[PDB]
Each structure stands twice: as structure tokens, then as C-alpha cells.
């Protein structure tokens, strides 16, 4: 249940509900993977969705149009969230977009099924831990919800 399907063949930004910031992937400067206020659009904020197959049918890899890297989310090692080359070579590259309901209609969690984690974008901690993850079979918080933007 609750599968969300992003559009294919068009780049999008991923904006956090709690943070009003969009994820990004860049090779420089550090941090390479972080988030940015949504009012400022930059190349590093654009991603496409890569459909999965087999065990990963209904899941997607999230590929940066700026670096070519896909996002990952794992419980260990550190860093727990980041990016890596390829088109989803590793299990922790495969996300179920888990559709929200109620006040979360229109939004989804980004659930890395293989690592049992969800992505987090928040402003309630220092910048070193604002873009992170949380166990997926635990409490749900607004900072785990994202939506897709085309501007
Ligand atoms: C740790 C931290 O808060 N760093 C930010 C930088 O990321 C940010 O740099 C901009 O980031 C956007 C991301 O889409 C573009 O890459 C842009 O070109 C960068 O300048 C700067 C400036 O906003 O602020 C902090 O340093
Ligand atoms: C900061 C950074 O990105 N370091 C990378 C590690 O992430 C990477 O570890 C692998 O990452 C993939 C991500 O999909 C899987 O989690 C895999 O199991 C990890 O071993 C290592 C090795 O490629 O390289 C850097 O340290
Ligand atoms: C680095 C690290 O693992 N820090 C964790 C925090 O992220 C975690 O904070 C919770 O995170 C969720 C994420 O959806 C919400 O932001 C929630 O409000 C936070 O309490 C805390 C508590 O579990 O543990 C570490 O500090």
C-alpha cells in the first residue's frame, strides 16, 4: 500500500515539508549532499527517478542531473546519507516513495527499503545533521515528508 510514483523523464526538486528546503547533489563545495532554501533554484537541486525492477519494482533510484550520482540511505557506516556513482548499483539506493495521507496528502517519505530508513530534511538541529535519516518502522515526523517541485 501507499506506493507513490514520481514522474519519469523530467527533472524535479525534492522539497522537505518541515524544512522548506530542497535536496541537492554537487561535487563542490562541501557538503556535497545537503539541502537549500527552496526560493533559490540551482542546478544541483535537480533529480530524475530511475524505476526499479524485480524485488525493486515500485521503488526508484534518485539520480542527480548535476553529478550523475544516486542518493543512498543506510544505518551504517557513516555518513548515513549521501550519493554514489551509478544508476542504483547498491541496495540502499532504492527508495519507496511512501505516500502520505491527511495533512500529508501530496507528500511522501523516501524509504530506503533495504536499510529500513527514511530520509530527513529538518532545521531543528545543526547543519551537520539536518539532512539525515531515521528508522522507517518507528515514529513518523513532518521532517520525513517531501514533495516534488518543477520550479
Ligand atoms: C553547510 C551550509 O549551510 N552550506 C551552505 C551552502 O550549501 C550554500 O551554498 C549554495 O548552495 C546551493 C545549493 O543548491 C548552490 O550550490 C549554490 O551555488 C551555493 O552557493 C551557501 C550559500 O547559500 O550557504 C552555506 O554555506
Ligand atoms: C562520503 C561517501 O560517500 N563515502 C563513500 C561510501 O559511502 C562508500 O560506501 C558504499 O556506499 C554505498 C552507497 O550506496 C553502499 O552503502 C555500500 O555498501 C558502501 O560500501 C565507500 C565505498 O564505495 O566509498 C566512500 O567511502
Ligand atoms: C545523528 C543522529 O542520529 N541524530 C539522532 C536524531 O536525528 C534523532 O532526532 C529525531 O529525528 C527525527 C527524524 O525524523 C525527528 O527530527 C525527531 O523530531 C527527532 O527527535 C534523535 C532522537 O531519536 O536521536 C539522535 O540524536
Describe this protein's structure.
The chain is mostly beta strands and 151 residues long. The protein has one domain (1-151). The protein is 0% helix and 38% strand. It has no helices and 13 strands. The chain has strands at 3-4, 13-16, 21-25, 33-37, 47-51, 60-64, 70-73, 81-84, 95-99, 108-112, 117-121, 131-135, 146-149. The strands form five sheets. A five-stranded antiparallel beta sheet has the order 1-9-10-11-12, with no helix packed on it. A molecule of 2 linked components (NAG-GAL) binds next to strand 4.
List the helices and strands and how they pair.
Blueprint: E1 3-4, E2 13-16, E3 21-25, E4 33-37, E5 47-51, E6 60-64, E7 70-73, E8 81-84, E9 95-99, E10 108-112, E11 117-121, E12 131-135, E13 146-149
Antiparallel strand pairs: 1-9, 2-13, 3-4, 5-6, 7-8, 9-10, 10-11, 11-12
This protein binds a molecule of 2 linked components (NAG-GAL) (3 copies).
Amino acid at each position: 500500500s501507499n506506493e507513490y510514483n514520481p514522474p519519469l523523464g523530467i527533472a524535479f526538486r525534492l522539497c522537505g515539508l518541515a524544512s522548506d528546503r530542497v535536496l541537492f547533489s554537487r561535487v563542490s563545495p562541501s557538503p556535497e549532499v545537503f539541502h537549500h532554501p527552496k526560493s533559490e533554484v540551482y542546478p544541483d537541486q535537480w533529480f530524475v527517478a530511475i524505476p526499479g525492477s524485480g524485488q525493486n519494482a515500485g521503488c526508484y533510484a534518485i539520480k542527480s542531473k548535476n553529478t550523475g550520482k544516486v542518493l543512498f540511505s543506510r544505518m551504517s557506516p557513516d555518513p548515513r546519507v549521501g550519493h554514489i556513482d551509478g544508476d542504483g548499483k547498491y541496495p540502499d539506493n532504492w527508495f519507496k516513495f511512501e505516500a502520505g495521507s491527511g495533512k500529508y496528502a501530496g507528500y511522501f517519505r523516501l524509504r530506503a527499503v533495504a536499510s529500513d530508513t527514511v530520509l530527513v530534511s529538518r532545521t531543528s538541529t545543526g547543519t551537520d545533521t539536518q539532512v539525515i535519516n531515521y528508522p522507517a518502522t518507528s515514529a513518523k515526523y513532518d521532517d520525513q515528508y517531501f514533495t516534488i517541485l518543477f520550479d
